[PDB]
């Protein structure tokens with residue numbers, strides 16, 4: 001028992017991290033098979049950052065301008081191409097530490113682990129969610145660009161995120177591994193609206209089920225609700241609407257605890273309307289939305305990779 | 306910017322995890338050089354667990370009774386000794402993936418990463434603190450015993466914790482890697498009192514500095530305090546007394562921020578006496594005590610391994 005914000009074991013990803021240098025900029029790349037993936041903004045200078053012409057900047061670069069180092073060993077670059085906001089550097093050696101992997105574009109409200117890296121060296125691992133507004137609330141300093149987010153299933157790493165930048169609000173924005181930003185963002189040093197964020201309701205309900213499984217039960221009540229009544233409350237408190245597809249994915253947790261999904265919704269409604277009254281749930285004094293139903297089941301069933 | 310509960314990259318530890326089987330019990334072991342370390346309770350059966358005679362149980366066992374498996378490959382056990390609450394199995398093969406490592410006995414209030422494992426396979430990684438009462442608030446299910454806690458400094462893993470048991474209160478107890486329990490605990494299925502716990506004051510102060518660095522500064526105020534006045538408040542709220550040694554280790558965060566340690570103590574006083582209202586500090590509605598001053602500096606300075 002116990003419930004923690006748990007990240008995937010990072011070893012399979014640690015062996016893919018490289019340093020990429022172009023001019024004076026150093027950031028991280030991801031070495032899979034004979035390709036290194038990194039943010040295209042490695043090719044910019046401070047002059048460029050307001051609105052870089054990435055096509056013109058890349059035309060001035062040759063394979064030998066991209067310095068790629070995997071720990072102490074220098075890789076030989078034999079081609080380069082830009083795909084959306086990522087550069088793909090072809091190297092002459094396949095990464096012998098390449099795991100089984102997939103590139104995936106995740107949905108808002110899904111979670112993933114981030115391996116924060118500086119100069120191609122791993123610093124730390126943490127779990128976070130893709131917000132409904134396609135930002136992430138990470139921990140990234142100057143030099144962390146190219147750090148990646150991922151999930152692991154059996155022996156297969158699903159890469160879903162590459163870090164590109166910090167918005168002036170201090171939240172984080174990045175791309176899938178085909179270089180398509182999540183959300184409206186562009187790789188330019190400009191103020192950029194994220195637009196309205198919301199609480200991931202299905203995740204809050206999964207976490208309440210996690211709390212009951214761990215014996216934190218004070219918020220259970222004598223009430224029930226409807227999906228329509230609940231969604232009226234959700235809209236008032238800037239929660240995502242709950243759909244039957246959300247109810248369906250909560251089924252295993254409903255079955256385990258014996259608490260019907262709409263009964264757990266009535267508990268959540270009362271927490272939204274009344275607050276916690278200075279009480280905690282799983283060590284938190286607010287409602288936690290960064291655990292998916294899959295996360296809760298995995299942590300509660302002890303699945304390994 | 307941003308502040309997350311960050312674990313160390315787990316790859317160096319993942320390469321040391323094995324499965325150990327004695328009779329019908331399977332748990333995790335740690336394979337370093339030519340020794341596998343695991344909880345000695347692997348040799349108990351259900352009849353034994355109220356008060357095992359570990360000396361008599363281990364006498365009934367021979368080298369060939371300890372099945373040690375690293376992924377698919379079987380290790381040959383050529384010796385066995387019990388050291389306190391750990392078993393040490395000498396194997397005929399040095400682990401080729403052994404990192405540079407140390408065994409260290411940590412102090413209460415220190416933090417470490419836990420690699421939670423089942424059947425010798427890594428499940429997840431999280432950060433946590435050794436509580437002042439020598440428990441840990443982890444996430445561990447049946448089969449997680451032998452999971453380890455560690456810190457990394459440069460290329461060196463310092464192993465500080467091996468998981469042994471869940472107390473009836475659902476908090477966790479375990480040993481250093483010499484098999485000495487943290488706290489008063491014994492490897493017996495008995496109700497066992499954990500001391501009174503306290504909040505780790507020096508860590509809360511470190512986290513308030515982390516909050517200012519990240520620009521959450523609403524809790525800063527016009528007040529100051531003294532070490533004696535603060536410590537009268539600390540005792541009323543079951544906070545550890547703050548010592549000059551604590552003030553000294555906050556020195557770098559005081560210098561970085563220009564906020565005198567006793568000013569930061571007067572912010573914490575007001576938070577203890579008034580609560581947060583319904584505001585948050587680094588995404589938390591309570592005062593966080595699982596970041597050390599060292600942790601905050603590392604995360605705020607971007608140190609790698």
Ligand SMILES: O=C1N[C@]2(C[C@H](C3CCC3)C2)C(=O)N1c1cncc(F)c1
Pocket residue numbers: 041044049140141142143144145164165166167186187188189306
């Ligand atoms: O290291 C960089 N450099 C850019 C990328 C660059 C902008 C202008 C082209 C896109 C400015 C950035 O946003 N960060 C950063 C990221 N994450 C946390 C941080 F603290 C900084």
Ligand SMILES: O=C1N[C@]2(C[C@H](C3CCC3)C2)C(=O)N1c1cncc(F)c1
Pocket residue numbers: 001346349354445446447448449450469470471472492493494
């Ligand atoms: O898997 C075991 N088995 C014992 C060890 C064993 C006690 C009685 C001899 C020492 C009973 C245990 O406490 N757990 C466990 C640990 N952590 C989280 C869990 F949910 C269970």
